[PDB]
Amino acid sequence: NYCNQMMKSRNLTKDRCKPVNTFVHESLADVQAVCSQKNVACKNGQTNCYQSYSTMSITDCRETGSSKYPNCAYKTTQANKHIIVACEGNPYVPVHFDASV
């Protein structure tokens, strides 16, 4: 199970079961590039979010209804969608995954 393996390997099941998380099957440089693409509002009202012009191969990991810490368990859903990330700093880089659309 991809999500069980990746959520564990990436520390997302050690301190708590992260209920939902998205993985992006693209290069880091192509995700960092989104920070100079379409400027959009974030869910929180801040305007440091950026939407990719293109769709990207992504995987959504979501905890099952019965899952509980420490035995975290996930269902995997594939999608090809535009990403929205919050960007910050110098260099101006992704710091949060806001949504897929």
């Binding site: 990436r10 992006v24 710091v95």
Partner: peptide, 15 residues
């Protein structure tokens, strides 16, 4: 004390 950028990569990147 990962930076936010480093945490984003660890949490979301799968090249």
């Amino acid at each position: 004390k990962e930076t936010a950028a480093a945490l984003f990569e660890r949490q979301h990147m799968d090249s």
